Amino acid sequence: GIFANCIFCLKVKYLPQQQQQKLQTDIKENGGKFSFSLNPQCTHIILDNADVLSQYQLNSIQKNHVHIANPDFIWKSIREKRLLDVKNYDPYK
């Protein structure tokens, strides 16, 4: 699937539960994995609008080359059946 070899840290606790679950199944059904914790194996971190990252988390992200993206990155990649340009979905741009 389009998310093969992607490991997403999910920080989307302010989304409705149905959307959180749909994010998870969209990721799993398309070859990806997710965790709720940020670690060096994460390739991506998905961040809803209301969630924030500490300086520690930002330092880890930079160190491990983690891509910061909003939920639209997942939604739109699924909709277009193609992994999109994650750089177009960076809230911390």
Numbering used by the authors: 4 to 96
What does the paper say about this structure?
pmcPARP4 is an ADP-ribosyltransferase (ART) that uses NAD+ as substrate to add ADP-ribose onto target proteins, a process called mono(ADP-ribosylation) or MARylation. PARP4 is also referred to as vault PARP since it can localize to the vault particle, a cytoplasmic ribonucleoprotein complex. PARP4 has a distinct domain composition relative to other PARP enzymes; however, the N-terminal region of PARP4 is homologous to a collection of domains found in PARP1, a regulator of multiple nuclear processes including the cellular response to DNA damage. Collectively, the study establishes the human PARP4 BRCT as a nucleic acid–binding module.
A double mutant to glutamine was created for the two neighboring lysine residues (K23/24Q), thus removing both charges and potentially limiting any redundancy or compensation at this location that might have occurred with single mutants. The K23/24Q double mutant of BRCT showed very little to no evidence of binding. Our mutagenesis results led to PARP4 BRCT variants that exhibited a range of deficiencies in binding to vtRNA, with the K23/24Q double mutant resulting in complete loss of BRCT binding to vtRNA. The double mutant K23/24Q led to the most notable increase in thermal stability. We noted an additional water molecule adjacent to residue 23 when it was mutated to glutamine in the K23/24Q structure. This local increase in hydrogen bonding potential conceivably contributed to the increase in thermal stability of this BRCT variant, as an increase in surface hydrogen bonding is a common explanation for enhanced thermostability. We analyzed the mutant with the strongest phenotype, K23/24Q, in the context of the BRCT-WGR-CAT fragment of PARP4. The K23/24Q mutation was also effective at considerably reducing vtRNA interaction in the BRCT-WGR-CAT fragment, and the deficiency was comparable to that of a complete BRCT deletion.
